[PDB]
């Protein structure tokens, strides 16, 4: 490994922690292409996230980020976020980008161009409709699923359908992103961020911060249940997506995040604790999920088990109850 690629893997371990191993297990040219894409997206996210960067400066940064990949000297020295090293040392990451085969460079660049446009559009707004929530999630997450899929197909480790079916790929990203958004309600509130869709929360309370107050806990949990029900709608696509993967290392890479998201949603379902802190699955639970999630029968078994758990906890008076039961039933009877 060049020193510059070695530095990239150091940043990958610093940024992705124990998921770094799963990336490092990817076969052949996939390994480096995903590592670099991971880092480049981390840089883009860090720009988007940084509230100390003004809108007039942020918009050009997001629009032009795809171009910076091709500018050997481009870096950004003014960030105040946790992962700011990937921006300060962007030249090292962009050098390794430019060492990828062109078929992987062009995927990453195109994705960054489109994600930038979409991120720039949401600087000025909160998410209103569920349709807008899917549009926002496409920009920040769904496009990541689509990019990764295109790397898998372009490397020829997976059939071209994996890269072409943008909707199944998009669903992979939306499932993770909506799960994060749901779970991070309170941490977001405290950082002054709002991602729950206004059209949903506005039917329970007047302001989204209201869900943190004790008198509204019943309403908060109803909204939580409704948004979780929304996220579950992506699981048929997730199953379809995973069922097409033929490469073991790619399977594990895609499957492990999804089962951990499923278990997280199950933990969060009808759970007051979402409104008081960060509900997380136990480390030993996570490890077992990661070790188990390596073939379709086992992933389906995990999904069905957590969905049955949710099913049996649905309160009769929950306003989303028959929608929750309906999507769980669809998932169960598909595979
Ligand atoms: C659409 O996303 C995928 C599709 C197929 C395969 C992998 C991913 C995903 O990585 C897995 C999620 N993840 C870990 C996995 C282990 C448990 C960890 C935990 O905190 O519990 C979280 C990540 O660190 C990265 C991440 O969150 N995203 C998803 C986003 C885009 C919704 C923010 C991500 C970013 C870039 C790249 Cl190159 C991949 C990924």
Q: Is 84 a catalytic residue?
A: no
Give the separation between CA 84 and CA 225, rounded to whole angstroms. Answer: 35
Residue 176 Cβ < 6 Å to ligand 1: yes
Give the structural domain span for 192.
Answer: 1-333
Residue 149 Cβ < 6 Å to ligand 1: no
Cα of 258 from ligand 1 centre, angstroms:
9
* CA-176 nearest atom, ligand 1: 32
For the beta carbon of residue 77, count every other beta carbon within 10 angstroms: 8
Give the separation between CA 195 and CA 185, rounded to whole angstroms. Answer: 8
Q: Is 332 a catalytic residue?
A: no
Cα of 19 from ligand 1 centre, angstroms:
8
Q: Is-contact 256 290, C-beta < 8 A?
A: yes
From 253, 269, 275, 306, active-site residue: 253
Give the separation between CA 247 and CA 125, rounded to whole angstroms. Answer: 40
Cβ neighbours of residue 180 closer than 8 Å, sequence gap 6 or more: none
CA angle 256, 116, 182 (to 5 degrees): 45
Q: Is-contact 198 126, C-beta < 8 A?
A: yes
CA 249, 251, 254, 259 torsion-angle sign:
negative
From 65, 139, 168, 183, active-site residue: 183
Give the separation between CA 118 and CA 123, rounded to whole angstroms. Answer: 9
Residue 279 Cβ < 6 Å to ligand 1: no
For the beta carbon of residue 57, count every other beta carbon within 10 angstroms: 13
Total count of residues recorded for the chain: 335
Cβ neighbours of residue 195 closer than 8 Å, sequence gap 6 or more: 127, 136, 181, 184, 188
Q: Is 183 a catalytic residue?
A: yes
Residue 35 Cβ < 6 Å to ligand 1: no
Residue 260 Cβ < 6 Å to ligand 1: yes
Q: How far is CA 238 from CA 69, 160, 256, in A?
A: 31, 17, 12
Q: Is-contact 265 179, C-beta < 8 A?
A: yes
Residue 240, both tokens: 């379809």
83 is in an annotated binding site: no
280 is in an annotated binding site: yes
Residue 142 Cβ < 6 Å to ligand 1: no
- Domain containing 110 — which CATH number? 1.10.600.10
Q: Write the burial class of residue 243 (CB in 10 Å: 0-12 exposed, 13-18 middle, 19+ buried).
A: middle
- Candidates 257, 262, 280: which one to mutate for ligand 1, based on the most atoms within 8 Å of Cβ? 257
- Tell me the three-class secondary structure of the chain, residue by residue: CCHHHHHHHHHHHHHHHHHHHHHHCCCCCHHHHHHHHHHHHHHHHHHHHCCCCCHHHHHHHHHHHHHHCCCCCCCCCCCCCCCCHHHHCHHHHHHHHHCCCHHHHHHHHHHHHHHHHHHHHHCCCCCCCHHHHHHHHHHHHHHHHHHHHHHHHHCCCCCHHHHHCHHHHHHHHHHHHHHHHHHCHHHHHHCCCCCCCHHHHCCCCCCHHHHHCHHHHHHHHHHHHHHHHHHHCCHHHHHHHHHCCCCHHHHHHHHHHHHHHHHHHHHHCCCHHHHCCCCCCCHHHHHHHHHHCCCHHHHHHHHHHHHHHHHHHCCCCCCCHHHHHHHHHHHHCCC
42 is in an annotated binding site: yes
Lookup result for tokens 């994600």: 115
Residue 261 Cβ < 6 Å to ligand 1: no
Q: Is 114 a catalytic residue?
A: no
Cα of 140 from ligand 1 centre, angstroms:
11
Long-range pairs for 205-210 at CB < 8 Å and ≥24 separation? none
For the beta carbon of residue 223, count every other beta carbon within 10 angstroms: 26
Residue with CA at minimum distance from ligand 1 atom 13: 257
Cα of 80 from ligand 1 centre, angstroms:
22
Give the total number of structural domains in the chain: 1
Give the separation between CA 16 and CA 42, rounded to whole angstroms. Answer: 10
């Amino acid at each position: 490994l060049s020193s510059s690629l070695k530095t990239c893997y150091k940043y990958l371990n610093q940024t992705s922690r124990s998921f770094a191993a799963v990336i490092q297990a990817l076969d052949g040219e996939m390994r480096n292409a995903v590592c670099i894409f991971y880092l480049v997206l981390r840089a883009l996210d860090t720009l988007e996230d940084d509230m100390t960067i003004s809108v007039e400066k942020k918009v050009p940064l997001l629009h032009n980020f795809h171009s910076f990949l091709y500018q050997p000297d481009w870096r950004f020295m003014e960030s105040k976020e946790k992962d700011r090293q990937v921006l300060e040392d962007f030249p090292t990451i962009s050098l390794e980008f430019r060492n990828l085969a062109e078929k992987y460079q062009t995927v990453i660049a195109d994705i960054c161009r489109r994600m930038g446009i979409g991120m720039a559009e949401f600087l000025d707004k909160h998410v209103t409709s569920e349709q807008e929530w899917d549009k926002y999630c496409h920009y920040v997450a769904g496009l990541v699923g689509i990019g990764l899929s295109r790397l898998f197909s372009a490397s020829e480790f997976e059939d071209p359908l994996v890269g072409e079916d943008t909707e199944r790929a998009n669903s992979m990203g939306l499932f993770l992103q909506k799960t994060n958004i749901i779970r991070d309600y309170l941490e977001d509130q405290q950082g002054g961020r709002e991602f729950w869709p206004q059209e949903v929360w506005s039917r329970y309370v007047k302001k989204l911060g209201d869900f943190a107050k004790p008198e509204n806990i019943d309403l908060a949990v109803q909204c939580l249940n409704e948004l979780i029900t929304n996220a579950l709608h992506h699981i048929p696509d997730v199953i379809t997506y995973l069922s097409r993967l033929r490469n073991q290392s790619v399977f594990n890479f895609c499957a492990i995040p999804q089962v951990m998201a499923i278990a997280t949603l199950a933990a969060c379902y009808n759970n007051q604790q979402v409104f008081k802190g960060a509900v997380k699955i136990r480390k030993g639970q996570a490890v077992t999920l990661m070790m188990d999630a390596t073939n379709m029968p086992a992933v389906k078994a995990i999904i069905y088990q957590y969905m049955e758990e949710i099913y049996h906890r649905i309160p009769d008076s929950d306003p989303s109850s028959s929608k929750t039961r309906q999507i769980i039933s669809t998932i169960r009877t598909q595979n």
